[PDB]
């Protein structure tokens, strides 16, 4: 190809500011939510877990990603590169599983009018790391000699030792998309639909459905970009570079408003519940 595989300057200018704003809003919102929770039932425990994992997700996602624009060289260590994606995937897993648990709890609150919540939260926090373990053993820095520079890409190595790791990397994008989008979205929607059917009031129904729609809309683009890179990338079309360039654009946008979904949970509590309204009020 021609080689215009690069990030636009206007893109950096917009994205640095946008990412900083969403990052700061998320940290203050989630810290305030956690403090209010600290100052007791199953919903409170699940919301606290969601907020804690949310804080972890933002602090592990935004800083390094926004560093990837100014420097795009990764001067860190091999172990940090091997570790960061594992923590990020674990945070995403606990976030989606906490959303699932919250939906189930809100269904059972109206359909069937803390130890069980603790044994369902430990299961979440261990299942997430169990399912994120394959990420921690795959990434590895390799210095490929580009025609003009000495790169330091921290990537998922195409050639690795373990055979199961190769088998997983074959369909990592598919598995990630499935487990982190389809299962939580479908389960949340089904449980909330049955919940609203049992109740029928309408305010709560529209609230939960708008929350589910916001989650899906704010989490779609990352999976869309990964799927497009997986299936629409070819080997013998000159347009490939442009597509890849466009992919980068879309990809970054995803991560930005991915964090937006992150910070949509505290705001949703401020806009609905009077108790939390008063809590955040002063």
């Amino acid at each position: 190809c021609q080689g215009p595989i690069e990030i636009k300057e206007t893109f950096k200018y917009i994205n640095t500011v946008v990412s900083c704003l969403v990052f700061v809003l998320g940290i203050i919102g989630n810290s305030t939510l956690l403090y209010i929770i600290y100052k007791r039932n199953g919903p409170n425990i699940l919301i606290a877990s969601l907020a804690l994992g949310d804080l972890l997700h933002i602090v592990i996602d935004i800083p390094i990603n926004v560093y990837k624009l100014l420097a795009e060289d990764w001067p860190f260590g091999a172990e940090m590169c091997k570790l960061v994606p594992f923590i990020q995937k674990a945070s995403v897993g606990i976030t989606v599983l906490s959303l699932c648990a919250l939906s189930i709890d809100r269904y059972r609150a109206v359909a069937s009018w803390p130890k069980w919540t603790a044994v369902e939260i430990v299961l979440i926090w261990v299942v997430s790391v169990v399912l994120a373990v394959p990420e921690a053993i795959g990434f590895d820095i390799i210095t490929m000699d580009y025609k003009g520079s000495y790169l330091r890409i921290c990537l998922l190595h195409p050639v690795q030792k373990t055979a199961f790791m190769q088998f997983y990397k074959t369909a990592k994008d598919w598995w990630l998309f499935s487990f982190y989008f389809c299962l939580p979205l479908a389960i949340t929607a089904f449980f909330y639909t049955l919940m609203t059917c049992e109740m029928l009031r309408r305010e709560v129904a529209k609230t939960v459905f708008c929350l589910v729609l916001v989650f899906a809309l704010c989490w779609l683009p990352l999976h869309l970009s990964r799927i497009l890179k997986l299936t629409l990338y070819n080997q013998n079309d000159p347009n490939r570079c442009e597509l890849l360039s466009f992919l980068l654009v879309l990809d970054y946008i995803g991560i930005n408003m991915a964090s937006l979904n992150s910070c949509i949970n505290p705001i949703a509590l401020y806009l609905v519940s009077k108790r939390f309204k008063n809590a955040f009020k002063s």
Binding site: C1, I5, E6, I7, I64, N65, K68, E72, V84, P85, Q88, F139, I142, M144, Y146, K147, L151, R152, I153, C154, L155, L156, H157, P158, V159, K169, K172, D173, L222, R226, L230, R240, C241, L244, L247, L248, D251, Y252, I255
Partner: peptide, 21 residues
């Protein structure tokens, strides 16, 4: 990030410029 091979100078550059995910 996933590349078919480490010899094509396009996928590796793309993952150099991509996000960590």
């Amino acid at each position: 990030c996933s590349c078919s091979s480490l010899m094509d100078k396009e996928c590796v550059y793309f993952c150099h410029l991509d996000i960590i995910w």
